[PDB]
Amino acid sequence: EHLGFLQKLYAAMHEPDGVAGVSAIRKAEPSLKEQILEHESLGLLRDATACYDRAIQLEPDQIIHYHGVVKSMLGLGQLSTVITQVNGVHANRSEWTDELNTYRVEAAWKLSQWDLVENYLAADGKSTTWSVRLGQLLLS
Amino acid sequence: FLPDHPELKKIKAVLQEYRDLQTTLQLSMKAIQHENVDVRIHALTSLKETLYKNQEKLIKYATDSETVEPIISQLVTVLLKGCQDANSQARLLCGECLGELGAIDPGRLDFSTTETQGKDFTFVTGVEDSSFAYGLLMELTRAYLAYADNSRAQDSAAYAIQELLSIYDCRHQLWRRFPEHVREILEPHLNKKPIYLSKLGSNFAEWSASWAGYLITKVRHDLASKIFTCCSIMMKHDFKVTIYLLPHILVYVLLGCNQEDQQEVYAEIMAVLKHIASDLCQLSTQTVFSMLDHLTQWARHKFQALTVDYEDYQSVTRFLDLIPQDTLAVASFRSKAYTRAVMHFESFITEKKQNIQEHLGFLQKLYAAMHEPDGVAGVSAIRKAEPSLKEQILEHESLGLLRDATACYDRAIQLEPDQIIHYHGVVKSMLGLGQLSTVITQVNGVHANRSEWTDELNTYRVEAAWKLSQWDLVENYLAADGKSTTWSVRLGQLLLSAKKRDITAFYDSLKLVRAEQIVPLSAASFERGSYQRGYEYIVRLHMLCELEHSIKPLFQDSLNWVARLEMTQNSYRAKEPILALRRALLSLNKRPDYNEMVGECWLQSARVARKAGHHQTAYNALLNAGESRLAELYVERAKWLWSKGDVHQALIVLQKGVELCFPTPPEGKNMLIHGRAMLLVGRFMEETANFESNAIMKKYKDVTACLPEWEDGHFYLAKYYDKLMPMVTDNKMEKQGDLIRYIVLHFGRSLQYGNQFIYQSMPRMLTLWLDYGTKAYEWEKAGRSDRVQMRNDLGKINKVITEHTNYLAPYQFLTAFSQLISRICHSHDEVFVVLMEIIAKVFLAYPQQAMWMMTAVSKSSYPMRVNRCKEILNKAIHMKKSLEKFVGDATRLTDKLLELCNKPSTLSMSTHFKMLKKLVEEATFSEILIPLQSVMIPTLPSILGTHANHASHEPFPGHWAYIAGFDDMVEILASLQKPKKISLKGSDGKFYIMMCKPKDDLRKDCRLMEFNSLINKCLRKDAESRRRELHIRTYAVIPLNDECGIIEWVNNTAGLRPILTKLYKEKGVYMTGKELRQCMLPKSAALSEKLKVFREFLLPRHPPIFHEWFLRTFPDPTSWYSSRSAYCRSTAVMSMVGYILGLGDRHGENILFDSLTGECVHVDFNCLFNKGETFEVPEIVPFRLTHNMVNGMGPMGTEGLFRRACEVTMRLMRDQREPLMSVLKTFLHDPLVEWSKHSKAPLVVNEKAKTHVLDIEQRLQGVIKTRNRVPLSIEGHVHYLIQEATDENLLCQMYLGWTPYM
Amino acid sequence: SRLAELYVERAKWLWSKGDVHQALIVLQKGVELCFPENETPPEGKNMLIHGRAMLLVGRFMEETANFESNAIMKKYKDVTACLPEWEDGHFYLAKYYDKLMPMVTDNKMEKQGDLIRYIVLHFGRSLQYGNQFIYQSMP
Ligand SMILES: Nc1ncnc2c1ncn2[C@@H]1O[C@H](COP(=O)(O)OP(=O)(O)OP(O)(O)=S)[C@@H](O)[C@H]1O
C-alpha cells in the first residue's frame, strides 16, 4: 500500500537511490511499466532497451513508451541507428508524428548535417525542445 | 532377395531360407543400402514408417547411455547412407526419415570408424595404363554410348571402338580385365585465340576443339597422334567426353608442344584465368585446374623419376611459371574454390616471401570465403598492420560476436552509407536479440528507402512475426510474401503456410523447403568430417522434420521436444536457433493449455544462454517470455546472473524467491529446484564469510532432507561436506572417518540414484575410500589413539561396502575396478581384502576386463599380491564353477602371451614358437575375444535414464572382437630391443599386430591413456570441442608382462624424426654425422654462443620442408585443406593437456605423424612432472616446435589461430578441475607407477610428486608459480606458453633432445 | 590520428574491460601505432602518451606473469629518460620502485638502502615536478 505512493514519491524525488530502496522494499517485483520505472533507476541502457521491447510486446499504446526506446537509441548514440529508429517512429506515430522528431533533431545535432538539420527544421513542434530548439537556432 | 511382404507367409518362406526391434533395424540398415534406387525409395518409405512405429521406443533406443547407442550408430550409418540421392524425391524421402530421427549431437555421434573420404588415390599416369584406356572405354560407355544411340555419333563411336581395338585386341587378358556386360555388347560391334570461351569456343567444347587441332601438331608422339585423331571425332560427339579426353590430351600436350605454341597455350590458360556458356568457362577454368592436377600426376611421374624426362619436368615447371598462383587465386574467387582456392593461395605464399599486408588483403577475402571459425580474427591477430575500420567492422561480423559492436556496424553506416548489403548487415543488427519493436521501427525505415533488401528485411520481420505469433502480423507478412526466399525466409513462407492451413499444398511447399535442404545435401557430399561441418545445415532440416510432425497435428511417437534436445547437439552458434525453432512451434500451437506451456522453452533457452553467456540476451529472453511465474525459474535466471556476477545480490534475490516459492514440500520439480537454490546458496556460503559453514551444513542437511530421492542434492551435499571435511581436521588428522563414512554413505546413495557428475564424483569417492583404508592401516601400525576406534571405522567402511553391495553395480564399479590394482597392494588386509572381494565380484561381472587387469597383476611377482589375486580368482571360482574354468584357460593364454612377449625382418611365430603357433591354432584353450583398448574403456550411462540404466548398459558396451590367433609367418620389427608386433586376425577378419618391449612401465602409461579419452569424451561433450572436432587418438596398450606390454601400431604411423628424415632425404640435403660430431658443445656452453652456432647450422640444415610435406601428404587440394584442419588438431590442445599434466618431455622421435589422417602421436611418456626433463637438459617449452612443424603450423600465418583455439580448448579442459585432480590422485595412488622409481613388496609415493599434484592444481589456477611476486589469466597462460614456444632460447638450452634444425 | 592516441586510450578501455591479455595485445599494438617500433615521441604531447603507454605497459607487465623485473626496471628507467621533467613518468616509476623495493629487501632491512635512496631521489624529483601523486608520495 505504501509502495504505490512510494513509486509516485520516487518520481517526485527524481532520485535513483530512493528508487533503488523502493525496489528492494517491494514484496512483488516490478513488471511492465513498474519494471520500466525500476530500469530508469538502474540506469542500464541494455536492460532499458529490453524493458521497452517487453513493454511494447505486451502493448504499444504509448508514444512515451516508444520515446523510452528512442532514449535507449540515444544511449546507443549511433547516428544510423537513431535515423532508423526515427523513420520507424514517424510511421508508427500516425497520431503524433515528430513527437520524438525533436529527439531526432538532437540526433541531427549529433549528425552535424545541414540537410539533416533541414528535415528537423521543416518539422514544426509546439515544444521548448530543450537543447534541440537551441540547435534549431544553431541550424542557420 | 529378402523384402517386406504384404503376405506374411511368403515373407516367412523367404525368412526360413534366409536363416527384436533392433534386429529389425539391422535388417532395415541392409534395406537402406539399395541394389536398385527405385527399390531404395520403397525402403525409405518403410524406414520412415519404422521410425514412426518405433515412436517413443525409437527415442528409448536413441537414449540409454551418455555414449551414443550402437543401434543409433547403425541408425547413424543410415544417416550417412540416408538423404544423399541424385533423384531429388529420393533424397527428400531419406531427409524426411532423418527428420523423424532428429539431429544427433555431432559430438554425440561416434562414427569416426568409417573410412569415408580417405581412399587409394584415383590418379594414375594414364593413356599408357590399360586402366586409363579402360577409362577411355568408359568414356565410350555412358554418354558416348548415348551418342552411339544417335546414328551420326554412333558411326564415330564405332570408329573410336575400332581405334581402341587397334590399341588393344577386342578379344584377351585386357578383355578379361574389361567389364564387358553392356560394354561387351558394344564391344562386338566395335570388333589467334580470343576463340576460347568467346565466339567460336562457345560453351567450352567448341573452344576445346580448336585447341585440339593445335594440340595434335604440338605433340609428336606417334601413339599420341593416333589417339588424338580418334579423340577429335569423339570430342565433337560429346562435350563431356571431350573434357575427359582433354585431361589426357593435356598431359600429351605438356609432353610435346611447339615452344612458341606452348607459350600461346599458357597465354590462353592465363587468358581464361584472367577472364550455361559462362558456367562452361568456369568449368573450363576447373578443367585447366584439372590439367594442373594432371600436371601434378606428371610431377608424380617425375617423382618416380630419380635428358627428356628432366626436360619434360622443366617444361612442366615452365607451365607452372606461365601460371600465376596469385592469378589462380583471383580465378579462385570467381571459382568459389574455397579450400581448393586456399591451397593455391598457400602455394603462392610459399613460392614468394611476401609482405603480410600485401598478403593480408588477399587473406581477408580468403577468410571471408573460408567462414573459418578463426576467420578474420586469426588473420587480424596475425596482421602487423592496423585493419581498415570498415574492414574491422567486417572482422566484427566475421567474429559474429553480436552484443557490443553491433552498434559499431551501425556506426560505420552512420558515418556514411555506401552499401545496401552493409545496411542489410546493419538490419541483422537491427534484429539484434530478436526484438520485435526494433523490427517494427526497421520496417518503417525499410519503407522510406526503396530497395530489394527492404523486402528481405520484411522477411526477417516475418520471422519476427513468427516470434509475434500474430495473425495480423501474418497478414502483414502476406503483402511481404512472394519474393526470392532465404532459407530462413522460406521458413517464414512455411509460417505463412501454417496461417494458410494449406495442408498437402503446404506439404509440397515443405518439399520445396526439402529441396533447399537437398542443396545443403549436395554441400553435404564431401571429404570425411563433412557431416559435423554440415550438421548445422542438417539441424535446419531437423527443425523442418520437427515442423512436419507439428503440421500433421494441425492438419487434423511421443516426439518430446525436450527428449529430442538432450540427444541434439547444443551449439552456441546453432543451439539458440534450435531452441528458437521449438519456440516457433510453441507459437504455432493454438492449444488452450499452452497459455502457460510456452515459457519453460524460453527458460531452457536461458539455461543454454548461461552456457553461451549473452547474459543481456538471456535477460532479454526473460523479457521475451515472462508470466507463468515459477519461483525456481526466477531463481535460475538469478543463478545465471549470479554466475555473471553480483552473486551476493542474486543470493538475496534467491532468498526472496524461496520465501515466494513456499510459505519442504517436493511439489514435483520445484522442491528439487529449491534444493538446487540451496546448492547455489551453499556455493554462495563458501563465497561469503557471513554465511556460516555449520549453518550451511544444517541447510545442506535440510536440502538432503527435502528430497531423499534426488542423488544430485546428496552429491552436492557430499561435495559440500568434503569441503566441510577437507579442512575439518584443519590439519588435526586423528579422528575423521566417522564423519567421512557418513559422507561416503551419502556418496553411495547419490551413486545409487546416479548423477551426471556422479562418475567423476564416484571415482573421487572410491579414492577417498582407498585413502581411508590406507589411513587406518597407517594408524594401525602406530598403535596411536584407539585400535577399536579405527576398528569401528573399518566396520563402517565394511558397512559402506555392503551398502554398495545392496546398491553395488558393475557399472557402479567402473573406474574403481581399474583402481583395485592399487587397492590390491594394501598392508591393512582384513576388511580391505574383503573390499577386494567386491572388486572380484566386479571381475565376475565381466571376464575379459578382469583378465586384462589380472594379466598385469600376474607379471609383477606380487607374491603376497600374487597369492591375493589367486585368492580373488579362487573366490570367483567358488562363485561360478564356469568362472573358475574360464579363468584357468585365460591364465594359460596369458602365460602363452607372456612367453611370446619375452620372445627369448619377418619373424614367424610358428617358425620359432612352434608350440605357441600351435596353441593359437588350437581351439582347446578356451576361445578369448581379442582385447580392445576401446573395449577396456568403460561405457558411459545416459543422463536421461535415472534408474537401472547402468544395469542395462554393458560396463563397457561394444561389438566384441574374438582373437583368431596370428599368422604363422609374419614380419618382425627390427630395432635395438625392438618390440615385435603381430596383429591377430579378427573373427570379422580385421587383424591388429601388438608389440611388447621389456623393462617398460606400460601400466603407469596405461592409466595415462585412461587419463585420456575421458577428457576426449569430455571434448565430445564440449560444444566448442565438437566445433573444433579435435578428436584425440588413443593408444592401445596391453602390457600383461610388467616388463613388456604389446601395443597395436596405426598404419602409416611415422616417427616425427623419421618423417623429418624423409623430408631431409626428399631435399637430398645431407648433414655429416661427423660434421655434427665436429660441432662441440661445452656442458656449460655460453647460451649466446651456442644459440648463434645452432641458428646458422639449423638454417642450412632445415630450410623448411613443411610446405612440401603438406603437398606430399594430400594429393587433393581439398584433402590438403582437411589435412590443414588435421594439422591444427595435431598437438595443439592435445599437446597442451600433456603440458598441463606437466608429465611428458616426449622425444621428437616419440612424437609421430599418421599419413592417412595426419595425427600427432605421443607415446612412452614415462616422465611425470618432467622428472626426465629435470634429468640432464631441461626444456620448459610446452610442445616441441620445429620451425618446419611451426612452418606447417604457420600456414598463411605462422602464428596459429588453431593453436589459440587449442588454448581455448585447454581453458575448457580445466572445467572439471576436481575430476582432473581425482585422475591425478589415481596416478599417484597406483603401486605400479613409481613416484620415485613385485613379489618383494606385492601389497612409489613422492612428497615432491604431491607438490607436483599441487603444481597441476596451480596449472588449473594458471598461476606462474616460477615468476617472482605476482593473478593468473587462462588466455594469458596460453599466450605465455605461445611466447615460450616462440622463444628459441629453450631450444639453445636443450642438448640433443629435439635436436631439430627446423 | 596515426598515433594510437585514443586507440592507446582504447587499450585503457580494454583495461576497463579488465582483460590483461587483450591489454597485452593492445600494448604490442600501441608501439606499432606510434611507429612500427615507436620511441617515446619527439612531439612533447606524443612523448607524454608514449611514456604513458610505456607506463601502462609496465603496469601490465607487473600484472603479467611473463615479465622480467630487470626488464620492467629498464622500461621505468626509459620512462624517466623520456622526460626528466614530467612528474607522471617519475610517479609511475616511483610506484614501480616501491613494488621492486619490497622484493629487493628479500626479508633483509640492511640490504635495502642504496636502492631506497635512488627511489627516494626519484620521489623527490617527482614531487617537485608535480604534487598530483605527491600526497601518496609524501606518505
Ligand atoms: N607404427 C609405428 N610407427 C611409428 N612409431 C611406432 C610404430 N609402432 C611403434 N612405434 C614406436 O616406435 C618404436 C619403433 O622402434 P624404434 O624407434 O626403431 O626403436 P626401439 O628402441 O625399439 O623403440 P623406441 O623406444 O621408440 S627408440 C616402438 O618401440 C614404439 O615406441
C-alpha cell at B320: 607452372
Nearest in space to B338 (alpha carbons), one of B1195, B1118, B1234, B1242: B1118
Classify residue B627 by burial, with Cβ atoms within 10 Å: 0-12, 13-18, 19+. exposed
Q: Cα separation of B312 and B335, whole Å?
A: 29
Residue B1188 cell numbers, joined: 618446419
DSSP state of B1270: -
Breaks (C-N over 2.5 A) in chain B follow: 19, 171, 191, 275, 306, 556, 663, 904, 1237, 1243, 1270
Q: What are the chain C neighbours of B1276 within 8 Å (beta carbons)?
A: 20-21, 24, 64-66
All residues at 6 or more sequence positions from A6 whose CB lies less than 8 Å from its CB, including other chains: A22, A25
**Size (chain A), residues:** 140
What are the backbone dihedrals phi and psi of residue B65, each rounded to the nearest 5 degrees, phi first?
-130, 155
Q: Give chain C's length.
A: 139
Using CA atoms, how far residue B262 sits from A33, B228, B249, B318, C29, in Å, is 79, 17, 14, 10, 50
Q: Which helix (H) or strand (E) holds B699?
A: helix B693-706
CB-CB contact of B389 with B422 (8 Å): no
Would you give the distance in Å from CA B79 to the centre of its chain?
Answer: 17
B/C touch flag: 3 or more CB pairs below 8 Å: yes
Q: Which amino acid is at B604?
A: Q
| Those residues with Cβ within 8 angstroms of residue B1252's Cβ, 6 or more apart along the chain or in another chain | B1142, B1168, B1169, B1246
Q: Do B445 and A87 touch (CB under 8 A)?
A: yes
B136/B167 Cα distance (integer angstroms): 11
> Which residues have a Cβ under 8 Å from the Cβ of B906 and sit 6 or more positions away?
B969, B970, B971, B972
Quickly list DSSP for B250-284. HHHHHHS--HHHHHHHHHHHHHHHH--HHHHHHHH
Which amino acid is present at B1197?
G
Taking the CB of residue B682, how many other CB atoms lie within 10 A of it? Answer: 23
8 A C-beta contact, residue B966 and residue B983: yes
Q: What is the C-alpha to C-alpha distance for residues C10 and C30, in angstroms, rounded to an integer?
A: 10
Question: Using the beta-carbon criterion (under 8 Å), do A84 and B430 form an inter-chain contact?
Answer: yes
Question: Which cell numbers in the block locate residue B578?
Answer: 534450435
- Using H for helix, E for strand and C for coil, what is the string for C76-135? HHHHHHHCCCCHHHHHHHHHHHHHHHHHHHCCCCCCCCHHHHHHHHHHHHHHHHCCCCHH
Q: What is the resolution of this structure in A?
A: 6.2
Nearest CA in chain B to A84: B445
Please judge whether B444 and A87 are an interchain contact, meaning their C-beta atoms are less than 8 angstroms apart.
Answer: yes
B1160 bridge partner residues? B1153
Any atom of ligand 1 within 6 Å of the Cβ of B1055: yes
Picking from A58, A80, A92, A110 by the largest number of B CB atoms within 10 A of its own CB, the best residue to mutate is: A80
Cell digits of residue C51? 611514456
For residue B200, the 8-state DSSP code is G
Q: Do B1273 and C20 touch (CB under 8 A)?
A: yes
Q: What type of residue sits at position B847?
A: P
Q: In ligand 1, which atom is closest to the CA atom of B977?
A: 22
Query: Under a CB-based contact definition with an 8 Å cutoff, are residues B794 and B831 in contact?
Result: yes
For strands B992-997 and B980-984, give the pairing.
Answer: antiparallel
Q: Which residue has the cell 519456440?
A: B583
Which of B1164, B1143, B1167, B1142 is CA-nearest to residue B1152? B1164
Q: Check residue B793 and give left, alpha or beta (phi > 0: left; psi -120 to 50: alpha).
A: alpha
Contacts of B438 in chain A (CB under 8 A): 53
Euclidean distance between the first and final Cα of chain C, in Å?
39
Find, among B649, B633, B566, the residue nearest to B596 by Cα: B633
Burial of B791 (0-12, 13-18, 19+ CB in 10 A): middle
- Cα–ligand 1 centroid distance for B905 (angstroms): 15
Q: Does residue B1166 line the site of ligand 1, with CB under 6 A? A: no
Give the 3-state DSSP-derived string for B1046-1099, with helices as H, strands as E and coil as C: EEECCCCEEEHHHHHHHHHHHHCCCCCHHHHHHCCCCCCCCHHHHHHHHHHHHH
CA distance A80 to B415: 8
Position B834, amino acid: V
Interface test with B, best of C66, C67, C73, C101 (most B CBs within 10 A): C66
Count of C-beta atoms within a 10 Å radius of residue B981? 19
Residue B355, class by beta-carbon neighbours within 10 Å (0-12 exposed, 13-18 middle, 19+ buried)?
exposed
Q: How wide is the angle at C-alpha B770 spanned by C-alphas B767 and B773, nearest 5°?
A: 155
CA dihedral (B1024, B1025, B1029, B1034) in degrees, to 10, reads: 180
Write the DSSP string, B822-885. HHHS-S--THHHHHHHHHHHHHHH-HHHHHHHHHHHHHS--HHHHHHHHHHHHHHHHH-HHHHH
Coil, strand or helix at B808: coil
Query: Buried b / exposed e across B522-546, counting CB within 10 Å, b at 16+?
Result: eebebbbbebbbbbbbbbbbbbbbb
Q: Is A119 on the interface with B (CB under 8 A)?
A: no
Compute the Cα dihedral for B594, B596, B602, B606 and give only its sign.
negative
Report the Cα B510 to chain-centroid distance in Å.
32
Residue B957's identity, in one-letter code, is P
Query: Quick one: closest CA in C to B1263, which residue?
Result: C65
Letter for the amino acid at B47? L
> Which residues neighbour A123 within 8 Å (Cβ) at sequence distance 6 or greater?
A98, A101, A102, A105
Where do we find the cell 584357460? B889
**B27 to each of B2, B37, B71, B1083, how far by Cα in Å?**
9, 17, 12, 70
Report the Cα A97 to chain-centroid distance in Å. Answer: 15
- Give the Å distance between the CA of B755 and the centre of ligand 1: 41
Please list every residue in chain C whose beta carbon sits closer than 8 Å to the beta carbon of residue B1268.
69, 103
Does the distance separating the beta carbons of A80 and B435 come in below 8 Å? Answer: no
CB C97 within 8 A of CB C87: no
Q: What is the CA radius of gyration of chain C?
A: 15
Instruction: Say which residues have a Cβ less than 8 Å from residue B952's Cβ, sequence separation at least 6.
Output: B64, B945
Distance of CA B45 to the CA centre of its chain: 32
CA-based nearest residue to A36, from A13, B949, A59, C7: A59
* A107 contacts: CB under 8 Å, gap ≥ 6: A73, A74, A79, A82, A83, A86
- Mutational test site, ligand 1, from B982, B983, B992, B997, max ligand atoms within 8 Å of CB: B997
CA–centroid distance, B1163 to ligand 1, in Å, is 9
d(CA B544, CA B541): 5
> End-to-end alpha-carbon separation of chain B, Å?
60
Question: What is d(CA B312, CA B320) in angstroms, rounded to the nearest whole number?
Answer: 12
Q: Which of B357, B1269, B1278, B1282 to mutate to test the interface with C (most CBs of C within 10 A)?
A: B1269
The reply to whether residue B1279 touches residue C36, judged by beta carbons under 8 angstroms, is no
Instruction: List CB contacts (< 8 A) between B623 and chain A.
Output: 50-51, 53-54, 57
**Which three-class secondary structure string do you get for B727-786?**
CCCCCCCCCCHHHHHHHHHHHHHHHHHCCCCHHHHHHHHHHHHHHHHHHHHHHHHHCCCC
CB B1263 within 8 A of CB B1037: no
Q: Do chains A and B touch (3 or more CB pairs under 8 A)?
A: yes
Q: Please give the Cα distance from B622 to B600 (Å, whole number).
A: 10
Could you give the dihedral angle defined by the CA atoms of residues B1177, B1183, B1189 and B1191, in that order, rounded to the nearest 10 degrees?
A: -110
What separation in Å is there between the alpha carbon of B956 and the centre of ligand 1? 30
- Cα first-last separation, chain A: 53
Count other Cβ atoms within 10 Å, centred on residue B1026. Answer: 22
SS3 B1043: coil
CB distance from A88 to chain B under 8 Å? yes
- The H or E element containing residue B1123 is helix B1117-1129
Cα separations in angstroms, B941 against B401, B714, B746, B1223 = 35, 19, 20, 19
Enter the DSSP assignment of B201: G
Q: How far apart are CA B1047 and CA A72, in angstroms?
A: 65
CA dist., res. B155 & res. B520, Å (int)? 42
Would you say B15 and B2 are in contact if contact means Cβ atoms under 8 Å apart?
yes
DSSP notation for B963-982? -----SS-----STT--EEE
Could C24 and B1276 be called an inter-chain contact, meaning their C-beta atoms sit closer than 8 Å? yes
List chains adjacent to chain B, taking adjacency as at least 3 C-beta pairs closer than 8 Å: A, C
The answer, for A50 touching chain B at a CB cutoff of 8 Å, is yes
Instruction: Tell whether C42 is within 8 A of chain B (Cβ).
Output: no
Contact B1267 C25 (CB under 8 A): no
Taking a C-beta distance cutoff of 8 angstroms, is the pair B108, B1020 a contact?
yes
Residue B1298, strand partner residues? none
Output DSSP code: residue B994: E
User: Which residue has its alpha carbon closest to ligand 1 atom 3?
Assistant: B1053
B435 touches chain A (CB under 8 A): yes
Distance from C-alpha of B488 to C-alpha of B495, rounded to nearest angstrom: 10
Residues near B726 by beta carbon (within 8 Å), at least 6 away in sequence: none
Name the grid cell of B295. 600436371
The chains in contact with chain C, meaning 3 or more Cβ pairs closer than 8 Å, are B
Q: Any idea what DSSP says for residue B142?
A: T
From B426, B436, B440, residue closest to A80, measured CB to CB: B426
> Cβ B384–C20 below 8 Å, yes or no?
no
- Burial label for B903, CB within 10 Å (0-12, 13-18, 19+), is middle
Cα distances (angstroms) measured from residue B1050 to each of B496, B1036, B1165, B1200 = 55, 10, 18, 27
DSSP string, C14-35: HHHHT-HHHHHHHHHHHHHHH-
CA max distance for chain B: 108
Q: How far is the CA of B978 from the centre of ligand 1 (A)?
A: 8
Cβ contact A111:A85 at 8 Å: no
- Enumerate the residues of chain C whose CB falls inside 8 A of the CB of residue B1287: none
Residue whose C-alpha is closest to residue B1166's, from B1235, B1238, B1072, B1267: B1235
Distance from C-alpha of B101 to C-alpha of B665, rounded to nearest angstrom: 39
Ramachandran sector of residue B469 (left: φ over 0; alpha: ψ -120 to 50; beta: rest):
left
Long-range interactions of B495-501: CB distance < 8 A, separation 24+: B495/B462, B495/B463, B495/B465, B495/B466, B495/B584, B495/B588, B496/B462, B498/B551, B498/B554, B498/B588, B499/B471, B499/B474, B501/B554
Contacts of B1013 (CB under 8 A, 6+ apart): B937, B1032, B1034
Residue B1250 grid cell: 604431491
3-state DSSP percent of chain B in helix, strand and coil, to 5 = 65, 0, 30
Q: How many residues does chain B have?
A: 1302
CA gyration radius for chain B?
34
Query: Which residue matches cell numbers 626509459?
Result: C78
Residues B1170, B1188: Cα–Cα separation, whole Å: 25
Amino acid at B1225: K
Distance from C-alpha of B1155 to C-alpha of B1148, rounded to nearest angstrom: 17
What is the atom index within ligand 1 of the atom nearest the CA of B1058?
A: 4
Q: Which residues contact B770 (CB under 8 A, 6 or more apart)?
A: B819, B822, B823, B1229
DSSP assigned state of B65: B
- B986-999 in b/e burial notation, b at 16+ Cβ within 10 A? eeeeebbbbbbbee
Strand-pair partners of B1153 = B1054, B1160
User: Nearest Cβ partner of B411 from A47, A78, A84?
Assistant: A78
Please provide the DSSP assignment of B420-480 as one string.
HHHHHHHHHHHHTTT-HHHHHHHHHHHHHS--HHHHHHHHHHHHHHHHHT-HHHHHHHHHH
Report whether residue B1051 contacts ligand 1, using a CB cutoff of 6 Å: no
Which residue is listed with cell 604431491? Answer: B1250
